[PDB]
C-alpha cells in the first residue's frame, strides 16, 4: 500500500492530453510498412504550395472559373489600378479559401512572408509593365500609382517574365497576427497598377488575363490549433 495523494485534474478527459492507454489488441502484428509517395510531415509543406487565387471575388464569377481571372486590357489611360485586396490571408475571401487560407483557418495565429506569383496568360505578342505594390497599414489603401509607389513594390515586365513573384515581407509590430480580423493585427493592402500599357499588335486580342497564386515562404509558422469555421454539420451524416 504505497501512500499517494491524488491532485486536482484526476478523472479528467482533456481532449488534448497525451497519456498512455492499455491496448485492446495485444500482440497484433501490424501489416508492414510501404514506401508510399508524397509523405507529409508538416502542414506548412502544404501551405508552401502555390494555389490559384480567386482575385475576382465577383458575385457572378465565384461560381465559375472567372474568379481566378484578373482582367487586363490595353487602355488609353496610364496608372489604372488592376486590383487591390487587403493582406488578410485567413479572413478576406480572396485568400481564406486558398490552400494557405484553409490551413490558416485551423489555427489562431500566423506569422511570415507570403509569395504572390502572377502569371500573364495573354498573347505571345503582347508586352507591358505592371506595378505590384504592398502598402503596409496606417495610411488608407493607395488610391493612385503615386501613392502605391512609396511602399514596397516591384515593376513586372511581361516581356521575359511570363511569371513574376512578389514576396511580401513580414512587417508587423508583433511576432504574429490573428488569422481572424483585428485592426490591432492589421497587415496592409496589396495593389496592382499599370506601369505601362498592354501594347498589342494587329489581329491579336488586346484584352488578356492574369492568374494569381499564393504560397508561404520559408519563414512562416502557425499557432494555437482550433477548428475551422468552413465545415458545418446539422445531423449525423449517413
Amino acid at each position: 500500500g504505497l501512500p499517494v495523494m491524488t491532485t486536482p485534474g484526476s478523472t479528467q478527459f482533456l481532449t488534448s492530453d497525451d497519456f498512455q492507454s492499455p491496448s485492446a489488441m495485444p500482440q497484433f502484428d501490424v501489416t508492414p510498412e510501404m514506401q508510399i509517395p508524397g509523405r507529409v510531415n508538416n502542414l506548412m509543406e502544404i501551405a508552401e504550395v502555390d494555389s490559384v487565387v480567386p482575385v475576382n471575388n465577383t458575385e457572378a464569377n465565384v461560381n465559375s472559373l472567372k474568379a481566378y481571372q484578373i482582367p487586363v486590357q490595353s487602355n488609353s489611360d496610364n496608372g489604372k489600378q488592376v486590383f487591390g485586396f487587403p493582406l488578410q490571408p485567413g479572413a478576406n475571401g480572396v485568400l481564406n479559401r486558398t490552400l494557405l487560407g484553409e490551413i490558416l483557418n485551423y489555427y489562431t495565429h500566423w506569422s511570415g512572408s507570403i509569395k504572390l506569383t502572377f502569371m500573364f496568360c495573354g498573347s505571345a505578342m503582347a508586352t507591358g509593365k505592371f506595378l505590384l505594390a504592398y502598402s503596409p497599414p496606417g495610411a488608407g489603401v493607395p488610391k493612385n500609382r503615386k501613392d502605391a509607389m512609396l511602399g514596397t513594390h516591384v515593376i513586372w515586365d511581361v516581356g521575359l517574365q511570363s511569371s513574376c513573384v512578389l514576396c511580401v515581407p513580414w512587417i508587423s509590430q508583433t511576432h504574429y497576427r490573428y488569422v481572424v480580423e483585428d485592426e490591432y493585427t492589421a497587415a496592409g493592402y496589396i495593389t496592382c497598377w499599370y506601369q505601362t500599357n498592354i501594347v498589342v499588335p494587329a489581329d491579336v486580342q488586346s484584352s488578356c488575363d492574369i492568374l494569381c497564386f499564393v504560397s508561404a515562404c520559408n519563414d512562416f509558422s502557425v499557432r494555437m490549433l482550433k477548428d475551422t469555421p468552413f465545415i458545418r454539420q446539422d445531423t449525423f451524416y449517413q
Partner: protein, 223 residues
C-alpha cells in the same frame, strides 16, 4: 524564425474528437445500441483526415457515457449505480440480437466494463488495416465488373460496436448516451489533397452539392 512544431500532422490530428454518439434504454430487449465504425459521419474529423489521401496511425478511443432519468410513475425511484458494457464485434463475429444475448460473454471479443461516476474509459488500438495504409478515398468499385458499390464503403469493414446496460434496472427507466472519441496517435500521412469545400452530404460517398469557390465582394478594388 519561429518553430512550426504545432503544425506537424501529429499535433494536427492528435486531439480527441467525437466521431459518433448513440443512446440506449434499460427497458425493452432492444435496449442495446450499435454502430458500424466509420469516420465519415462527423464533419470536422472527416475533413481533417480527408486533407490527405492515405493515412496510417494508432487510435486512442475515449468514451463519454452519460445517463439520465426518464419519466416514471413509481412513488420512489432510487436507481443504484449503473454499469455499462461496450463490446467490439469484428466483421464476421456473432452479433448481440438482444440485451441478454450470449455474445455479451465476450470470450474473445474485447470489451470494456465501466461503472458510472469514474474517469471515462480509454482504449488504444493498433493499425488494423489490411493495406499498408488507411485509404481516405477510393476511385473504384467493389465488384470487378465495374459495378455494385462505388467509393470508400467497399473498403470500410472495421466491424461494429455495441453498447448495453449491465444493470437490471427495474423501477425507474434510464436512458444513456455514449459518445465515441477518436484521437489518432503515431500518424503517417501521404499525398495531400484539397481541403473540402462543399458541405458534406453522405457518410458513404463524396456526393456534394456545388457551392461557389469563395465568399464574394463587389469589385476587384473592393477593400
Amino acid at each position: 524564425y519561429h518553430s512550426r512544431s504545432e503544425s506537424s500532422i501529429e499535433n494536427f490530428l492528435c486531439r480527441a474528437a467525437c466521431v459518433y454518439y448513440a443512446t440506449y434504454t434499460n427497458n425493452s430487449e432492444k435496449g442495446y445500441a450499435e454502430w458500424v465504425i466509420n469516420t465519415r459521419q462527423v464533419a470536422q474529423l472527416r475533413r481533417k483526415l480527408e486533407l490527405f489521401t492515405y493515412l496510417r496511425f494508432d487510435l486512442e478511443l475515449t468514451f463519454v457515457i452519460t445517463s439520465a432519468q426518464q419519466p416514471s410513475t413509481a412513488t420512489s425511484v432510487d436507481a443504484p449505480v449503473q454499469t455499462h458494457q461496450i463490446m467490439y464485434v469484428p466483421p464476421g463475429g456473432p452479433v448481440p440480437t438482444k440485451v441478454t444475448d450470449y455474445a455479451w460473454q465476450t470470450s474473445t471479443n474485447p470489451s470494456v466494463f465501466w461503472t458510472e461516476g469514474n474517469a471515462p474509459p480509454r482504449m488504444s488500438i493498433p493499425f488494423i488495416s489490411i493495406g499498408n495504409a488507411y485509404s481516405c478515398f477510393y476511385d473504384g468499385w467493389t465488384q470487378f465488373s465495374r459495378n455494385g458499390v462505388y467509393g470508400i464503403n467497399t473498403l470500410n469493414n472495421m466491424g461494429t460496436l455495441y453498447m448495453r446496460h449491465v444493470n437490471e434496472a427495474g423501477q425507474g427507466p434510464i436512458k444513456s448516451t455514449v459518445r465515441i472519441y477518436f484521437k489518432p496517435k503515431h500518424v503517417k500521412a501521404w499525398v495531400p489533397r484539397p481541403p473540402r469545400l462543399c458541405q458534406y452530404e453522405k457518410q458513404k460517398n463524396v456526393n456534394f452539392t456545388p457551392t461557389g469557390v469563395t465568399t464574394t465582394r463587389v469589385g476587384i478594388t473592393t477593400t
